[PDB]
């Protein structure tokens, strides 16, 4: 299952292209100009089988909770409502979002005791890198 290693309230300490990624995303550019500023605190709990990862910050507050490889209703942080699903692979936790034909990926693993988040769309491919706090 999800190692116990992503448990805990982490920290975005870099983050690189993730105008480019939103930009992929349809996100306006206002909205755009707010996500580059934004510093979330990403928070990862588990209740039996039941993984939450909350976002906080400033500008917006999002929070998913899911089992694994059971597809469910998410609603992001730019307002997309998507159906999306969370995976292990080989020991990455793996996020596929679906909505109006189009897909995203974010994939976090766990690199030097942080968390890196892989997110790809239409080819951009933005990295966000956490602390642990
Ligand atoms: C919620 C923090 C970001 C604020 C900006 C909201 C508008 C666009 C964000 C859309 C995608 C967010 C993906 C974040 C991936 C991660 O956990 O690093
Ligand atoms: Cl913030």
Same mark, same amino acid.
């Given at each position: ?5 992503? &448990?805990?309230? *982490?920290?975005? %300490? +870099? ?8 930009? @992929? ?8 100009? &707010?996500?580059?500023? @934004?510093?979330?605190? %990403?928070?990862? +709990? =588990? ?27 998410? $609603? $992001? ?8 699903? %969370? ?11 679906? *909505? ?15 968390? %890196? ?14 602390? =642990?706090?």
């Amino acid at each position: 299952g999800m190692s116990n290693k992503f &448990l805990g309230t *982490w920290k975005l %300490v +870099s983050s690189e292209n993730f105008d480019d990624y939103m930009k @992929a995303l349809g996100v306006g550019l206002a909205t755009r100009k &707010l996500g580059n500023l @934004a510093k979330p605190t %990403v928070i990862i +709990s =588990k209740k039996g089988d039941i993984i939450t990862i909350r976002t906080e910050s400033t500008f917006k507050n999002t929070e998913i909770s899911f089992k694994l490889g059971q597809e469910f209703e998410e $609603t $992001t942080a730019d307002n997309r409502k998507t159906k999306s699903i %969370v995976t292990l692979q080989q020991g990455s936790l793996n996020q596929v979002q679906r *909505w109006d034909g189009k897909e995203t990926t974010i994939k976090r693993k766990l690199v030097n005791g942080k968390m %890196v988040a892989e997110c790809k769309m239409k080819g951009v491919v933005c990295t966000r890198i956490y602390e =642990k706090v």
